[PDB]
Amino acid sequence: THVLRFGGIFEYVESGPMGAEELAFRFAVNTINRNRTLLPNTTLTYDTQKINLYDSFEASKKACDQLSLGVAAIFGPSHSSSANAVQSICNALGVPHIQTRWKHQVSDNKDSFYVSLYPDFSSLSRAILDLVQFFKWKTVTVVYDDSTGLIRLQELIKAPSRYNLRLKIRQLPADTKDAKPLLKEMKRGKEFHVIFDCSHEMAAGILKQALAMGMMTEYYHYIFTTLDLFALDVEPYRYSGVNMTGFRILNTENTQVSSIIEKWSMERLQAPPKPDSGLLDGFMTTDAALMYDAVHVVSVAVQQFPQMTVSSLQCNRHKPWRFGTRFMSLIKEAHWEGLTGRITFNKTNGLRTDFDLDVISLKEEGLEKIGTWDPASGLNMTE
Amino acid sequence: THVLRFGGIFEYVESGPMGAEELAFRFAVNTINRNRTLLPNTTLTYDTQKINLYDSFEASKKACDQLSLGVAAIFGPSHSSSANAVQSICNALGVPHIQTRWKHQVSDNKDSFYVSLYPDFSSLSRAILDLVQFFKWKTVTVVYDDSTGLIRLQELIKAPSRYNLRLKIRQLPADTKDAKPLLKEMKRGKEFHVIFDCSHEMAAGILKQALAMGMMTEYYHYIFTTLDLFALDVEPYRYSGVNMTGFRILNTENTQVSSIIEKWSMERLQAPPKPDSGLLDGFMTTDAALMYDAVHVVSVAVQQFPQMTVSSLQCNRHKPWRFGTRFMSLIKEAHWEGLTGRITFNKTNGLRTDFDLDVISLKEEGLEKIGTWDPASGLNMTE
Amino acid sequence: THVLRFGGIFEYVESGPMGAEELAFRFAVNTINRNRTLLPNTTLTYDTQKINLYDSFEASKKACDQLSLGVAAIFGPSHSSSANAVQSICNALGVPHIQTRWKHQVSDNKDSFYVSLYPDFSSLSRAILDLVQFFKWKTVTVVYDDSTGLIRLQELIKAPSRYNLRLKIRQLPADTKDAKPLLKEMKRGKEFHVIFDCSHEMAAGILKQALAMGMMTEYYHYIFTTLDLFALDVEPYRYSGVNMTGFRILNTENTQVSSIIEKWSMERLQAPPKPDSGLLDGFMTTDAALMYDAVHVVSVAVQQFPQMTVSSLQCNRHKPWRFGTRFMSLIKEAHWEGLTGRITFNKTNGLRTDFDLDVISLKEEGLEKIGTWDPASGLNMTE
Amino acid sequence: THVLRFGGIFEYVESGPMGAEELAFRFAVNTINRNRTLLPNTTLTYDTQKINLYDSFEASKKACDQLSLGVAAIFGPSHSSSANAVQSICNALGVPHIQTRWKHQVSDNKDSFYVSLYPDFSSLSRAILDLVQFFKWKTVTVVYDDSTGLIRLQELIKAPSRYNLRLKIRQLPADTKDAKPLLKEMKRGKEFHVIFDCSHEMAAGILKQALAMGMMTEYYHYIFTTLDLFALDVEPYRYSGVNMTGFRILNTENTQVSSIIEKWSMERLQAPPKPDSGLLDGFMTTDAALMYDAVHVVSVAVQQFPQMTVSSLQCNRHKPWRFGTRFMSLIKEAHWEGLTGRITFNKTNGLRTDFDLDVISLKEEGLEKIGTWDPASGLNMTE
């Protein structure tokens, strides 16, 4: 057999229940080592470690401790500041780094030992621009959460340079969950079409706030850049007539993915979120799905090269892994059809710039897919 | 008494001369320890270390090595990826981290042991917006270089939501400094009023291709976010009739600052003499000036804290510096009349938001000051 | 094999290489000597002399010294006063005088033993007038350098009487090359269509001054009366948008002429262009081309007239040359397809009023022929 | 005693005895010697040679023959082509040259042994411009015969660049006195104000065709740049009501000048002017006056240089004249006052630029003096 171990750095929430990404990582390794189809002899081992996600030194220490122990891959923390340091450590010591969240990559950063399964926001911004094109929008407003959102929507912000759009870029107030003043100053300008660049939780929050204000009508259209739009309590919004739209990468249409999501929902019920939050119950966040997909993709990559040996690399001396370049290359060339559709990393840099999105809009019966999106092909509306 | 040591994580050069920031750090250390008035019974010693600035692991190792011996304050690197890791290390070990270049601040980063002397772009973008309001501009063409530039100037991009401006965001090519297609696109669109978010090295090149494209005429107006506009060889452009507004925080109008600049030029024994870069020769860059001011500000803060003994801190066992809190508080509330002017740091965060800018513009006799921008009083552009 | 001597007077260069005209004369003599098709049973030798080009006494003394030896034709100086003196001497002694530069001949002069190869500025100025008609110009500013430029383009100056133009004649500042005040006056007068009458060196200087003055835009159109427009380094102006226009008599399009130009450039190896001069390196000026063509035309003329034993001509005795009349008639009626196209001398006067010009213009890909001009056919502007 | 003789080169004529220039030269030579006040012990002797004025070889040979004999100074030919050769010979041999007619000056010709008594056509053109500004002209038609007229009236032609004058440059037909087509073109062009740069005989002819065309009305103003306008037969136009205007340097309004002119007219009894020519009778043209004044200027210069024993310079080998430099300085520093008013030579040029004109216009009588022009003050229009 094998004692292959994957390193995982996740958020530390002592007061609350276990995190979604870490629980999905455990679920994925359990599925991999239980299903007698992938990695028959190899059995995955847990090396979960918890950090605060906002202290790069703690994450660096945890990653160095993991690499000192037997670890074949690092599943990076979902924060830019921590993940940058973690991938720098991994690149220096040659261990592959896997990221399941978007991190702003510096153009001059010469790091090669990292692959991110979150869809690249260049392609996602192109998809949002294609949505804006399809609706014949002229004057639009963008409402982002963090300054990095401007980076996440640069291919859409740059559109008026070449297009005839009219961006009215706004931002939700920081350190405050109240989006009421922004909506108040937004209604005065008659902003019919709005693009929201916030997380699904705060997207639901601002939707509830707008409904309390009576903002949305039959004449208001919303596009959400979050991929967790399907996991929203849209029942208060069924017949309101709002033209809500968004993207979704979790391939819930496939029966296998649906069964996996249902098993996730029934297994993850120790401490569900509060019902008065605006999110459903039988749902899987796209970050958990991407963690599952990442574990499976790394399992596929290691399957083709079974002669690996797990080392005890130390951070004190830069010792590249004996098999770190080959494993990294196979991970970058690994293809797998999983929860978030087809996974294919770009060869130039390790990112998912080729993915299959589904455009889900608010019909009269919940949120239903109205087409697909493929970077090679473009918008594929069928209805 | 005893000697006092400072951190010196700087750029690494293969075979060329030391960088401007490193030389400014050394020059400042020499200035304080050669001056009787500043720290009479105290000697300043430098511990400069060279890194790639794009290897967060290398920066972390250098910071840990410096803190393993006596270092009282780390003047961290000049890149976001490395500066974040060094800042996290300094916060964990309770040593002040003084940074002289801009870096995106995460909204949920709980870091208290860091001071930035770069004029906060939250205020400098407001200054650019005040200029474009002064010139009665109804359409601008904000042009940036790196995606982080969007994070830099966000208070200027959110202007159409409150003003009647028309922004056309554009990005310079990343493959090479060949902006001729971009300048041709700007010329075709009759976009005369342009804002450049670049560096002086890149701004000089962009001006060169703008002259090559005939874009420097009596109709075009360029506003530069660079604070090194005075360091541009504007002889070919001064007679073109084009007015190129900008800013300058380096208080070159003062006589002590001018003398220090002259000494800097005299001691600069290795400068690029190539007559094709578009930059002048006898001028101190704003980054070197900010590093000089950083050393001086930390010197002033040290003078207010006698009996401060520097200990040896190990990254393996997280043990905060005993004198870190008092020294950090003294650095935060430190006022100094340095080369960049008044140096007062904000109290809530560590950023420098209150600074005295000097708006400059290009006339037939060169680049000359045409006013002064102050956050408290706005633009005092009355000549 | 009858021997033959060709007299020539050229500029005296105190140091370095000799003038381009003397090099062209020597190269043409060598080419005729090595070619057996031209002048088969004969030979050509040269008797080059050097003068200041401004001392008519020196030119007269050199011409008399050459006439003391047996010379068949004198290739006189390229300056008005010295050329006039040598032409009078040759007309008195009966030997032909071959001149390749424009020189004002007074109306009542009766000299017959002289022929000119420079395109007469009564047909060429008519070509600039035809270009002005084609461009539909209504306001034109003619800018010349020397006082003899008005007498040169007199047919262009006398245009408003017979057409509808707004000539605004201006003169380049004498004793200096800095035309910044003149260009500022032209810009203040909104004079966008300018016809420059200056040498290619001064043309390049004025182009540099206008680029520094912001006059290199799509608004400004410059017509150059110089025939060496191909020798200007238009790298900084091709992308500006100026539609620079001019002529080129040098038949560079031909393969034989291109081969001869390449041979001349390879043989030159002398007088490298100044880095900031603004001219090109491997291009031959039209003056050297006309000297080469003059030697070839006189070789053709003497080919048709064998047994011409050149005798000694005494200036003091003043005995006309025995073969002078018929040899000069043959030169005047000679025909030759040389470097500067077809070389046909007028019958009434010896000037060259019949020539083919290649109207070239500046595009984004450099200068390239855009039409053809012929005194009989007129403009044939077809790109 | 100390005998000094002057050499002169004039026109060769066969019908008339000798030209007016030589008449004035002989009159001056045999007047100064008789007047014992000027040159008490130095008899002036004329050495007259006659040339074709269009053969630079003949003029050069005659000048060399004269310089072989003892000659203090050469009174060069009244042409513009042989005068250049003679002045070059004089400069090379270091002998003063005196020119009484205007010839085109090469910009870079380094000659310092010539003085031109003809009022230079750079102050005369400014006088014409001041005269047309005084009359408040807007449409001006410049007419000339010799192309060199463009070089002469270049300051007048360069007027539209500064002011609003609309110059319409025209040229009289060459080799033909039937100027009717030009006058018809004027009639069809409705050109009312004309500036004639033609000789007095040609001016009278042009006035004759104008009267034949009925163009001597009250709406037609004629400015004549010629200084011999007072010599015209204006009786047939005296009551025509025209506004004919010109200039007059020949100070006829002086007792001594009037007596000298009367004596010259009395001596001129060999060839009366043609009765049917439009010219007066018994008058002295400005060229003869300039020659007479030139001889007196040289006499004043030699007054202070009484030791200049003439030499026997040969043209075969150039030998500078020992007395040439100081005699030339005295020539250029002689403020003699004669028929053409105050005679002062420009130190940096040698030409006469500071002269005193007297504006004359047609009235009920013949050409009364209506003003005075000086280069320093300006147009002193008193009338």
Ligand SMILES: *[C@@H]1O[C@H](CO)[C@@H](O)[C@H](O)[C@H]1NC(C)=O
């Ligand atoms: C909103 O607009 C979309 C765009 O076609 C449409 O499919 C949807 O039915 C609309 N919803 C309404 C009108 O409630």
Ligand SMILES: *[C@@H]1O[C@H](CO)[C@@H](O)[C@H](O)[C@H]1NC(C)=O
């Ligand atoms: C959409 O996708 C299908 C298959 O996924 C493909 O055959 C088709 O060409 C695409 N485009 C359109 C417009 O249907």
Ligand SMILES: *[C@@H]1O[C@H](CO)[C@@H](O)[C@H](O)[C@H]1NC(C)=O
């Ligand atoms: C001069 O600067 C002003 C800014 O007040 C600008 O509006 C104008 O276009 C400039 N003039 C030029 C570029 O000729």
Ligand SMILES: *[C@@H]1O[C@H](CO)[C@@H](O)[C@H](O)[C@H]1NC(C)=O
């Ligand atoms: C602007 O500056 C001038 C000169 O420094 C000063 O007199 C004036 O009071 C200032 N105005 C302000 C600060 O509002």
Ligand SMILES: *[C@@H]1O[C@H](CO)[C@@H](O)[C@H](O)[C@H]1NC(C)=O
């Ligand atoms: C050619 O010149 C005209 C001006 O007559 C100008 O309008 C046009 O743009 C020019 N063509 C170019 C620059 O390609």
Ligand SMILES: *[C@@H]1O[C@H](CO)[C@@H](O)[C@H](O)[C@H]1NC(C)=O
């Ligand atoms: C212009 O030149 C072309 C040759 O390219 C010729 O065919 C055409 O006839 C010419 N047009 C004239 C002479 O009008």
Ligand SMILES: *[C@@H]1O[C@H](CO)[C@@H](O)[C@H](O)[C@H]1NC(C)=O
């Ligand atoms: C002009 O002529 C008058 C004639 O009386 C004279 O008094 C005056 O001094 C002259 N000059 C000026 C500048 O008026």
